[PDB]
Amino acid sequence: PKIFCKSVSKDPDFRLKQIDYVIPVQQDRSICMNNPLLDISDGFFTYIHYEGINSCKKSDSFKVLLSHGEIVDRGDYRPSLYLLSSHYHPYSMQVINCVPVTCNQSSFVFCHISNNTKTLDNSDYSSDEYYITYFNGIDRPKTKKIPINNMTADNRYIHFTFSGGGGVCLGEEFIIPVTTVINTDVFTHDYCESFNCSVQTGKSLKEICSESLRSPTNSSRYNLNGIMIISQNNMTDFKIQLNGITYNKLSFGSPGRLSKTLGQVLYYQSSMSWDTYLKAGFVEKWKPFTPNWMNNTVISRPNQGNCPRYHKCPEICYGGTYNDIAPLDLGKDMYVSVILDSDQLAENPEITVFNSTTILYKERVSKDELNTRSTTTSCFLFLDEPWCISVLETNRFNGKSIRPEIYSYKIPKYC
Ligand X SMILES: *[C@@H]1O[C@H](CO)[C@@H](O)[C@H](O)[C@H]1NC(C)=O
Ligand Y SMILES: *[C@@H]1O[C@H](CO)[C@@H](O[C@@H]2O[C@H](CO)[C@@H](O[C@@H]3O[C@H](CO)[C@@H](O)[C@H](O)[C@@H]3O)[C@H](O)[C@H]2NC(C)=O)[C@H](O)[C@H]1NC(C)=O
Ligand Z SMILES: *[C@@H]1O[C@H](CO)[C@@H](O[C@@H]2O[C@H](CO)[C@@H](O)[C@H](O)[C@H]2NC(C)=O)[C@H](O)[C@H]1NC(C)=O
Q: Which residues bind another protein (CB under 8 A)?
A: 54-57, 198, 200-202, 216-217, 272, 301-306, 315, 317-321, 340, 343-347, 369, 371-373, 393-395, 398-399, 402
Q: Cα dist. 42→3, 46, 283 in Å?
A: 22, 11, 20
Which among ligand Z, ligand X, ligand Y, none contacts residue 104 (Cβ within 5 to 8 A by kind)?
ligand X
Strand order in the sheet with 17-19: 17-19, 405-410, 386-395, 371-381
CA 327 – CA 337 distance, rounded (Å):
9
Contact window for ligand Z (CB under 6 A) among 52-60, 62-70, 215-223, 290-298: 215-223
Give whichever of 143 and 218 is closer to ligand Z, judged by the CB atom: 218
Q: Pick from 89, 221, 257, 279: which binds ligand Z (CB under 6 A)?
A: 221
Which among ligand Y, another protein, ligand X, none contacts residue 126 (Cβ within 5 to 8 A by kind)?
none
Which among ligand Z, another protein, ligand X, none contacts residue 319 (Cβ within 5 to 8 A by kind)?
another protein
CA 59 – CA 93 distance, rounded (Å):
8
Say if CB 98 and CB 64 are below 8 A apart. yes
Give whichever of 128 and 275 is closer to ligand X, judged by the CB atom: 128
Task: Name the minimum Å distance from CB 302 to another protein.
Answer: 5
Q: Which residue is nearest to ligand X (CB)?
A: 104
Give whichever of 119 and 374 is closer to ligand X, judged by the CB atom: 119
Give whichever of 112 and 221 is closer to ligand X, judged by the CB atom: 112
Nearest to 291 by CA among 255, 359, 244: 244
State the Cα angle at 125 between 122 and 127, rounded to 5°: 75
Task: Name the minimum Å distance from CB 358 to ligand Y.
Answer: 5
Establish if 218 lies at the interface with ligand Z (CB under 6 A).
Answer: yes
Query: Which secondary structure element, helix H or strand E, spans residue 207, and what is its range?
Result: helix 205-211
In one-letter notation, the amino acid at residue 399 is G
Residues lying near ligand Y in the complex (CB under 6 A) are found at 7-8, 333, 355-358, 360
Residues 89 to 128: which contact ligand Z by CB under 6 A?
121-122
Task: Name the minimum Å distance from CB 59 to ligand Z.
Answer: 15
Which among ligand X, ligand Z, another protein, none contacts residue 122 (Cβ within 5 to 8 A by kind)?
ligand Z
Residues lying near ligand X in the complex (CB under 6 A) are found at 103-104, 115, 128-129, 172, 281, 292-295
Which among ligand Z, another protein, ligand X, none contacts residue 68 (Cβ within 5 to 8 A by kind)?
none
Q: Cα dist. 371→378, 389, 400, 405 in Å?
A: 21, 19, 12, 12
Which among ligand Y, ligand Z, ligand X, none contacts residue 198 (Cβ within 5 to 8 A by kind)?
none
End-to-end CA distance of the chain: 16
3-state class (DSSP) for residue 393:
strand
Task: Name the minimum Å distance from CB 356 to another protein.
Answer: 24
CA 29 – CA 35 distance, rounded (Å):
17
State the Cα angle at 365 between 380 and 362, rounded to 5°: 70
Say if CB 214 and CB 221 are below 8 A apart. yes
Say if CB 262 and CB 330 are below 8 A apart. yes
Residue 302 CB burial class (10 angstroms; 0-12, 13-18, ≥19): buried
Give whichever of 196 and 358 is closer to another protein, judged by the CB atom: 196
Q: What is the CA radius of gyration of the chain?
A: 20
Establish if 220 lies at the interface with ligand Z (CB under 6 A).
Answer: yes
Task: Name the minimum Å distance from CB 10 to ligand Y.
Answer: 12
Which among another protein, ligand Y, ligand X, none contacts residue 294 (Cβ within 5 to 8 A by kind)?
ligand X
Task: Name the minimum Å distance from CB 212 to ligand Y.
Answer: 29
3-state class (DSSP) for residue 312:
strand
Q: How many CB atoms sit inside 10 A of residue 190's CB?
A: 11
Establish if 129 lies at the interface with ligand Z (CB under 6 A).
Answer: no
**In which region does residue 75 sit, left (phi positive, over 0), alpha (psi from -120 to 50) or beta (all else)?**
left
Which among ligand Z, another protein, ligand Y, none contacts residue 358 (Cβ within 5 to 8 A by kind)?
ligand Y
Transcribe 270-296 into DSSP letters. Answer: ---SSB-S--EEEEEETTTBEEEE---
Contact window for ligand Z (CB under 6 A) among 194-202, 218-226, 277-285, 316-324: 218-226
Which among ligand X, another protein, ligand Z, none contacts residue 220 (Cβ within 5 to 8 A by kind)?
ligand Z
Binding pattern to ligand Z, positions 178-197, x when CB under 6 A?
-----x--------------
CA 50 – CA 66 distance, rounded (Å):
9
Q: Which residues bind ligand Z (CB under 6 A)?
A: 121-122, 158, 183, 218, 220-221
